[PDB]
């Protein structure tokens, strides 16, 4: 029955909970396969789908974006999500589908960007619609990625990778990286991504891994800082998550260390 993630408590959102800030009138663009607005632990705001063949955002045959949205409403329970459909059936997306989904959010004043998606590959094209996004004034939080550890390499997915994009990676209950949560120095922060319960289709709820769900929780933290400091930019909202973020290990795997919502909505 209703899923909260444990890691609501981990990051500290219940304190701005009581404090009255739930992310009221912070418009969230959910970039992903769709969400079920049928279920009814979910609101959605509206959408648009830029995959050719399936024309309803509204509909998630992938069971992914349900999920996404039930634990950005877990962190932000009044957040306006809307629907960006623009990965298909097989679960990936053309460049050019993800960057209509990024000029949709542009032009329809999205507060917070979630990309929980990645390619090994960039687009010059993709960097330019993400970091034109930013300099528009919007938080654009990315999944890290589920390459793990790859040596001395980078194994941040794209568009996490760019410099413009908060990069998220994944621990569990206990603070440990998960072993898949890619790394890399272009990883920002970390946030729950192990065994989080949310939203499914169908009026069901599940536990999911990944740097997707750990992702989500950043952008939901997105939506309450805003809440309570409304004319705060992107810039101070990405500065109050990464300059009070809990020290976990190396920055190469860690980054900046735990999300601590309620230390970055004093900052």
Known sequence: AKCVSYGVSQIKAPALHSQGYTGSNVKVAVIDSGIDSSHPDLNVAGGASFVPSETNPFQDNNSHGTHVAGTVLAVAPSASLYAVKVLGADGSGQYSWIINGIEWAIANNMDVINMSLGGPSGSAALKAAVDKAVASGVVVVAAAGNSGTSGSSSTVSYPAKYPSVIAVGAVDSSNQRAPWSSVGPELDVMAPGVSICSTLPGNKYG?????????????????????????????????????????????????????????????
């Not at 101070?236 to 970055?264: C, H, M, P, W």
């Open 207 to 267: 536990a999911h891994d990944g740097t997707c769900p750990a992702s989500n929780h950043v952008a939901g933290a997105a939506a309450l800082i805003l809440s309570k400091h409304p004319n705060w930019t992107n810039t101070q909202v990405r500065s109050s998550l990464e300059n009070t973020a809990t020290k976990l290990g190396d920055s190469f795997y860690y980054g900046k260390g735990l999300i601590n919502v309620e230390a970055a909505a004093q900052h």
